[PDB]
């Protein structure tokens, strides 16, 4: 598929090099296509990929959260898998570089849904954890944001060391966090 | 000094135009130095930049030294250090050059080396907070080096990915996190 071949190449460059490094010229180069083809704007093509990868990851979580009976377990598992997936999280460096370039209102709103789809996972976990009586979170939305970000950090800023120690820290985190929720 | 001048001009160049667009040539001429001198002192731009970061680390460190006197107990120093990490970063000019630099060398073991001796330094701060926290029964951590790495990165995540809303809200979430976190300790 040509349209999904650009989506393919781009994603690659966006991960390897940054959002800046990757240029519309290259995307075309390694695609045997042409500017005339493209996906009008670059930030358009990019946010497209974010959506995809966001969805791919969210789905996998589902076809996977099954192995977790308690929401406490759900929390741990989500944080762990974050470290191993091949979806969304491998693009954080790129996302960051992008964000530092949030002025055009047609963005923070065009991403307001990407922001929530990313914290939802934790929303469900925390809320249903209240429904299931595993803890007592008043400010759910907050904790969800707090967690989504703390985790994204452990995942993003330690991507330079034994993948198994990361999983160890990450688990110690989940431990620490949930223990503090009451 | 001619070394210090190069570091200074370079820090400004990077800030005004970012890492990638800044050439060692600009740096040479504006610091009134020489390609030779710059090679001798830093070999590469990448190395030059690491040295600046290193210097900033020191400054941050000394700055934190003066500031923690505001927080009597370690529990407090924890709360404070994170707040500072979030607010100071909001208006740190080098941040942009740093981002650029990272997402450009975080796939090169070479630079990735020092990047760690550097990161580690950022982490010591927490290590001290937590160690001292023990010696005062503020808590009992037995895996300090870890909780420290945990904190340093969880907090950096909040700071770096929260970027998307009013500054007061971020500060609130950061403080909430510090509350939760210090709660699940012992």
Swiss-Prot record, chain A:
For this protein, the record's PROSITE patterns field holds:
HTH_TETR_1, HTH_TETR_2
Give the highest taxon in the source lineage. Answer: Bacteria
Look up the DNA-binding region in the UniProt entry and give its residue ranges.
Answer: 23-39
Q: What GO molecular function terms would the record report?
A: DNA binding; DNA-binding transcription factor activity
Q: Write the record's keywords in alphabetical order, separated by commas.
A: DNA-binding, Plasmid, Repressor, Transcription, Transcription regulation
Listed Gene3D superfamilies: Homeodomain-like (1.10.10.60), Tetracycline Repressor, domain 2 (1.10.357.10)
- Domain HTH tetR-type residue range list: 1-57
GO BP term (any one): negative regulation of DNA-templated transcription
Q: Does the keyword Transcription apply?
A: yes
Task: State the function annotated in the UniProt record.
Answer: Transcriptional repressor of qacA. Binds to IR1, an unusually long 28 bp operator, which is located downstream from the qacA promoter and overlaps its transcription start site. QacR is induced from its IR1 site by binding to one of many structurally dissimilar cationic lipophilic compounds, which are also substrates of QacA.
Assembly: Homodimer. Binds cooperatively to DNA as a pair of dimers.
Which protein are we looking at?
HTH-type transcriptional regulator QacR
């Amino acid at each position: 598929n040509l349209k999904d071949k650009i989506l393919g190449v781009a994603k690659e460059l966006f991960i390897k090099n940054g959002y800046n490094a990757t240029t519309t010229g290259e995307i075309v180069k390694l695609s045997e296509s042409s500017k005339g083809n493209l996906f009008k704007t670059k930030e358009n093509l990019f946010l497209e990929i974010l959506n995809i990868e966001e969805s791919k990851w969210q789905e996998q979580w589902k076809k996977e959260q099954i192995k977790a009976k308690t929401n406490r377990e759900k929390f741990y598992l989500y944080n762990e898998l974050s470290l191993t997936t091949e979806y969304y999280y491998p693009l954080q460096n790129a996302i960051i570089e992008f964000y530092t370039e949030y002025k055009t209102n047609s963005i923070n709103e065009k991403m307001n849904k990407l922001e929530n789809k990313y914290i939802d996972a934790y929303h469900v976990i925390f809320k249903e954890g209240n429904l299931n009586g595993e803890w007592s979170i008043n400010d759910v939305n907050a904790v969800s944001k707090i967690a989504a970000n703390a985790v994204n950090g452990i995942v993003t800023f330690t991507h330079e060391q034994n993948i198994n120690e990361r999983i160890k820290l990450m688990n110690k985190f989940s431990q620490i966090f949930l223990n503090g929720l009451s």
